[PDB]
Structures are given as C-alpha cells and as structure tokens.
C-alpha cells in the first residue's frame, strides 16, 4: 500500500524503475540540481511522474517553476513523515480524478486531443455540456479540464495539491464539490 525506495542510478533509470510500480509510489534520490538536497518522484498516473525538488530554507533561490517543497534542515532527517504529510494525500487526489467517470487520456493530457474530442462529443449530443479531465504528462501534478458549454471547446488547469485541487486559484479539498463548483459556473456568460 504505497512503497517507498531510497537510492544511495540516476533520473533516466529512476522513471524506469517507476514504471514498474504503483500509482502513489515513491523514489527518493540524490537531486541532479544540487548537492545536499534531494528529489522525491511519485506516480501520478501511467507515465506520469511528478519529481518533487525539496529544498532546505533559506539555502536555495526563493524562485521554484516545478514542483517544490520547503523544508527545514531537520526535517530532511524524516523523509518517510515528509512523504505522508505530502506526497499521500496528493497521490490520493490524484486517483480521485483517475477514478472520475469522464476522465481520459488524450495521450497524456494533449490538448488538440481533449478539444477534438470535446467537438467531437458535442456533435454526438447537441443540448449536453460534454467535459473530460486529463492529465498533464509535460506538467505533472495539473490536470487538464475541458467542456463545451456552446461551439467552442475550453479548457482550465487543475491542479493537485497537499490539501486539494486548486481550480481558478480556489482549493476544494474534495472532487465532488470541485465539480458541483465546476458544472454550477461552466455554463456562465464567461
């Protein structure tokens, strides 16, 4: 039920290794960014892996893009409290929106994919709001969300986060009342 691997290999053998293994596990290894400092990869879904840069305060940039997580010199000492206190419960997340009825691949989250079937689904059902969730390969962690409300197919990010999913900078902290939140304003003048 979620294993954890330490390495003492590097980023190429790492994905490797994961593709072997379950959706919420994790790889904790030396970091290529820098030394002293470490990378904690997790499975968010079939050949999608978030690397999670963990940083020590005060000693990096306070500039991150990718996933970044902050952390106390001491803190580095539990690295298996630092995986459930943030990695579980964004893996479950994570698995809630693979277990969505409307989720889809689209070849890792491709967005002419998601619009072309979005298109596609509205010519099937004119008076229906069709609307798919994918995730993001090039942006592990985000999840694509596209609908149809009239001709045109849109499209937001997801995002996935400790304490839920961010949508238009909300947190919800549970998928049904992301998508209660969702389909109460997918239909508004936008």
């Avoid at 050949?47 to 996933?67: C, M, P, T, W």
Wanted: hydrophobic share 35%; with cysteine.
């Amino acid at each position: 039920x979620x294993x954890x691997x330490x390495x003492x290999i590097n980023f190429k053998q790492a994905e490797k290794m994961m593709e072997t293994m379950d959706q919420g596990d994790v790889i904790i290894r030396p970091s290529s960014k820098g030394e002293n400092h470490l990378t904690v990869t997790w499975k968010v879904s079939d050949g999608i892996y978030q690397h999670v840069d963990v940083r020590e305060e005060g000693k990096e940039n306070a500039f991150s893009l990718g996933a970044t997580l902050w952390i106390n010199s001491e803190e580095f000492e539990d690295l298996d409290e630092i995986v459930a206190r943030y990695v579980q419960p964004m893996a479950s997340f994570a698995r809630d929106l693979l277990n969505h009825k409307y989720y889809q691949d689209c070849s890792g989250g491709d967005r002419k994919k998601l619009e072309e079937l979005l298109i596609k689904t509205k010519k099937e059902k004119p008076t229906f709001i069709p609307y798919f969730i994918c995730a993001c390969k090039e942006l592990p962690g985000k999840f694509l969300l596209g609908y149809q409300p009239r001709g045109k197919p849109r499209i937001e990010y997801v995002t996935v986060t400790p304490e839920g999913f961010r949508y238009r900078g909300q947190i919800f902290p549970t998928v049904n009342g992301l998508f209660r939140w969702f389909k109460d304003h997918y239909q508004d003048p936008v």
